[PDB]
């Protein structure tokens, strides 16, 4: 029924850009383009024309796009928008769209559009902002189509997708400009920005310039191989694609911490003295303990995060004994270099928009312009908010995954300022309604509403990325009394949503008290089946925290990493060179007379 | 000691002349595009001068660091007040910038030099007539004056090259040439000490003379091409010898061997790198070559 992909099918995407309010715009677009068409050439149609005619007309459009009058510019942009749509048959308009878009790329529309977008940047109701809207439309469409085929023109999409993520705009990638728009909106000092389209465009550009979940898994595999780590035990995406609602598909894992803890327990119990953070000394223990140690250490799973943290503390130990490293400028890295200055404001703004768009800063300004009209406007506003939530959740999840893959401390620096803004209680509050209705909300006019369900799965995946292996945050998950909310969301018959709810229930079932375990077993059975099992884990029989302290320690770690890798100017003030070159040489009468008379 | 750091690639045709600001980190580059550009420190220019017609040949900076004089094909000289650093390159045009215009010899200005007395400047042309100027009083000399320059230790004495193969020295208040010393002679410079004066021959022999008897104290073969330009350290230690071999060399005023050699320029035609310019406060070196590619090493 539901097929979790990085994005819904192309037709649903295109339908999920225009509000049900800005319908008539389409007419205008044609009634604009056609008219100019009529004057440029006569008695022909755009479809019956040929290649160089199309290219000439496109160059004419780009030329006209630089008049100094906002009104004529709006007219020309509406024409370009109609071109980008091209419009009969849905497959026909799809092909013609792909064609027209690659044409507009070839002529070079995108840079002109970006310049005009800056122009509009440096300056209620829908018509409050049409031009921007119009402009944004085109850009989205372009990216959409270009990425809709990102799975001839191969060189075209490659060079495009490469330049879109390259710092060519104020020396910052396009996503940085979109983040700037979002911030300038949430600050209340730009109350006219259309936010659904800005957010959608940011999502799609992050997607195409960083890669979806499949390219994510592939890059993960390559970075594993490069670092020498053994390959991943499963194909997580496939395993989850081959689950069901409510087998043991997950090969068990055991992190080093568990090995050390178990070994020290055994040492205390059999040797009368603990050793401390050593996992090779096993000689005095009985053979049935060597067996367990071997079984553990043969099921060990060392992720990129551990080795990266190790390399980080290493660099910090020996700074200038060759420790100075080069970092690849993969698009995730450049995007992080761009975001780093003002990340926390970005995160706070995203979360504010989210909370304003939860089912229950005037975000609906974009869509607002008979009882039938009131009903249509209501369903339209709900759709607007649904799309906003989908876009924001997807952006956050993609950023989290790609940063963690790029370097763990970037993921931590994002997650810290994401939780400081109370993202955990925010998400939980988002889940404190009748989730089933939200998922089956058929809020669209020409089962599972793929939009809402995708967004909910993403919110759960995020919440998991936030609270995992961090005891304080798990205790936070307990404090807000999440369990009755999670196991109520467990009713959705989807498999991935169930899996990601259980990923949390299992992580907090130890602190929920025996009685709770004794009361809820169906959920414990589900946790048994679905979630991966860790060896020597004690969720099923658990017995049982300095939040601010653990935070302020992780914060220090993060800031050390950031200062080392992105403040090379000030970095290491102890050891500095001195310019021995002769730039220094140029860098009261007695003082002459006597000094000369010296000899 | 000197590694490439900048390549000021925004001029189309060959950059004939270039000179560094005394204190600011700013470089002025005159090309054959009839336009010259000021840069402040993969870098983009900060100003472009739209007043000269015909390719620019020679350039000099006001030693105070506020005015620039240029003279090339148009047989005229322009005198701008350079905008200070941190100005906007894409700004409103200011017509006052071209404050000064000098109309003199009817021929192209091949040699330009500024005077440390802050009231005069030497302009030699292909006309055969060197002119001393005051920014309206001009003292002319009717002696092929390829290169004519201003001795620094005494502003009274000045030098003059010639396409013959010799160079003549003369005075300021006398206009009477003192002595000659010994074929094209591309570029002549004057040491910041009175006697030493360096010349570059078409025969690839850098030669040295004194302002008191013009003795051929030293003639070292420099490169495999006619040495086009010379540049003198602001404290007289090293010496840039730009040659048509697309190979600039930092010689030392004591050790006259290849103390350092950098080679990065293209032989766009029979002519190669035009000019070389030291700094005076920041120790940068810039080279303006035939392919319009100003290299800057730090």
């Amino acid at each position: 029924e539901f097929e979790y992909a990085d994005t819904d099918k192309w037709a649903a995407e295109l339908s999920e850009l225009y509000s049900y309010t800005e319908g008539p715009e389409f007419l205008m677009n044609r009634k604009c383009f056609e008219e100019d068409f009529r004057i440029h050439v006569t008695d022909k149609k755009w479809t019956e024309l040929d290649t160089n005619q199309h290219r000439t007309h496109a160059m004419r459009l780009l030329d006209g796009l630089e008049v100094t009058a906002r009104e004529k510019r709006l007219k020309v942009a509406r024409a370009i928008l109609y071109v980008a749509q091209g419009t009969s048959s849905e497959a026909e308009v799809q092909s013609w769209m792909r064609y027209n878009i690659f044409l507009l790329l070839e002529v070079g529309t995108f840079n002109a559009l970006v310049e005009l977008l800056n122009m509009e940047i440096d300056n209620i109701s829908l018509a409050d902002s049409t031009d921007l809207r119009v402009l944004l439309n085109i850009m989205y469409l372009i990216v959409e189509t270009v990425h809709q085929e990102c799975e001839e023109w191969r060189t075209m999409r490659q060079t495009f997708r490469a330049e879109l993520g390259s710092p060519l705009y104020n020396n910052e990638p396009f996503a940085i400009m979109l983040f700037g728009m979002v911030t300038k909106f949430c600050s209340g000092h730009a109350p006219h920005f259309p936010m659904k389209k800005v957010l959608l465009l940011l999502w799609k550009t992050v997607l195409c310039t960083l890669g979806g979940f499949e390219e994510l898994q592939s890059m993960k595999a390559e970075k594993r191989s490069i670092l020498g780590l053994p390959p991943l035990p499963e194909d997580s995406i496939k395993v989850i694609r081959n689950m069901r609602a409510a087998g043991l598909p997950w090969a068990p894992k055991v992190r080093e911490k568990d090995i050390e803890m178990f070994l020290e327990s055994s040492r205390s119990k059999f040797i009368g003295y603990t050793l401390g953070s050593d996992t090779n000394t096993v000689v005095g223990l009985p053979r049935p303990i060597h067996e367990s140690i071997k079984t553990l250490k043969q099921h060990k799973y060392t992720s990129i995060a551990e080795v990266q943290a190790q390399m980080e503390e290493e660099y910090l130990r020996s700074p200038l004994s060759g420790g100075e490293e080069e970092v690849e400028q993969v698009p995730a890295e450049t995007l992080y270099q761009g975001l780093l200055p003002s990340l926390p404001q970005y995160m706070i703004a995203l979360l504010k928009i989210l909370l304003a768009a939860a089912p229950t800063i005037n975000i609906l300004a974009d869509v607002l312009p008979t009882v039938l009209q009131s009903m249509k406007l209501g369903v339209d506003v709900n759709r607007h908010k649904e799309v906003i939530v989908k876009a924001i959740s997807a952006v956050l999840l993609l950023l989290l995954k790609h940063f963690k893959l790029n370097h763990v401390y970037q993921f931590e620096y994002m997650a810290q300022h994401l939780v400081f803004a109370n993202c955990i209680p925010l998400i939980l509050k988002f889940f404190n309604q009748n989730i089933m209705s939200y998922i089956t909300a058929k809020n669209s006019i020409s089962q599972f509403c793929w939009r809402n369900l995708f967004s909910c799965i993403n919110l759960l995946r995020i919440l998991n990325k936030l609270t995992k292996w961090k005891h304080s945050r798990t205790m936070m998950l307990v404090v807000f009394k999440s369990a009755p909310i999670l196991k109520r969301a467990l009713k959705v018959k989807q498999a991935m949503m169930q899996l990601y709810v259980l990923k949390l229930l299992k992580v907090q079932t130890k602190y929920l008290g025996r009685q709770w375990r004794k009361s809820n077993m169906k959920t414990m059975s589900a946790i048994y089946q679905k979630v991966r099992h860790r060896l020597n884990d004690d969720w099923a029989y658990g017995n049982d925290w300095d939040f601010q302290a653990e935070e302020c320690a992780l914060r220090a770690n993060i800031e050390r990493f950031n200062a080392r890798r992105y403040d090379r100017a000030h970095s290491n003030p102890d050891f500095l060179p001195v310019d021995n070159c002769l730039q220094s040489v140029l860098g009261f009468q007695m003082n002459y007379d006597l000094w000369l008379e010296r000899e | 000691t000197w590694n490439p750091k900048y390549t000021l690639r925004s001029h189309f045709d060959g950059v004939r002349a270039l000179a560094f600001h005394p204190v600011e980190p700013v470089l002025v580059t005159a090309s054959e595009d009839h336009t010259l550009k000021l840069w402040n420190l993969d870098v983009e220019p900060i100003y472009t001068f739209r007043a000269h017609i015909g390719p620019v040949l020679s350039l000099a900076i006001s030693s105070n660091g506020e005015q620039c004089f240029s003279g090339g094909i148009d047989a005229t000289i322009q005198w701008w007040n350079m905008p200070s650093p941190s100005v906007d390159p894409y700004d409103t045009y200011e017509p006052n910038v071209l404050a000064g215009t000098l109309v003199g010899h009817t021929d192209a200005v091949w040699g330009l030099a500024y005077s440390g007395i802050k009231n005069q400047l030497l302009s030699c042309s292909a006309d055969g007539t060197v002119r001393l100027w005051n920014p309206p009083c001009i003292c002319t000399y009717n002696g092929i004056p390829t290169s004519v320059d201003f001795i620094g230790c005494d502003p009274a004495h000045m030098v003059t090259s010639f396409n013959t193969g010799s160079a003549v020295i003369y005075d300021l208040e006398t206009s009477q040439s003192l002595v000659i010393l010994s074929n094209h002679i591309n570029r002549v410079v004057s040491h910041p000490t009175l006697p030493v004066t360096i010349t570059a021959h078409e025969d690839r022999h850098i030669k040295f003379f004194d302002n008191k008897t013009g003795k051929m104290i030293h003639s070292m073969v420099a490169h495999l091409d006619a040495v086009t330009s010379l540049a003198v350290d602001p404290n007289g230690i090293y010496l840039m010898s730009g040659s048509h071999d697309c190979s600039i060399r930092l010689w030392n005023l004591d050790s006259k061997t290849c103390v350092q050699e950098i080679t990065a320029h293209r032989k766009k035609l029979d002519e190669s790198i035009y000019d070389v310019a030291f700094h005076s406060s920041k120790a940068y070196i810039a080279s303006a070559g035939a392919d319009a590619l100003a290299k800057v090493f730090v």
């Binding site: 060179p577 021995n580 040489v585 | 000490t193 007289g236 230690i237 005023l253 004591d254």
Partner: peptide, 25 residues
């Protein structure tokens, strides 16, 4: 760094030696 300082000092003393010889005349 110390070697670079040494070379700069050698340069400066060569400068002063030349300047004083020039002053001699």
């Amino acid at each position: 760094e110390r070697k670079g300082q040494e070379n700069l000092k050698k340069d400066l003393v060569r400068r002063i030696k030349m300047l004083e010889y020039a002053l001699k005349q």
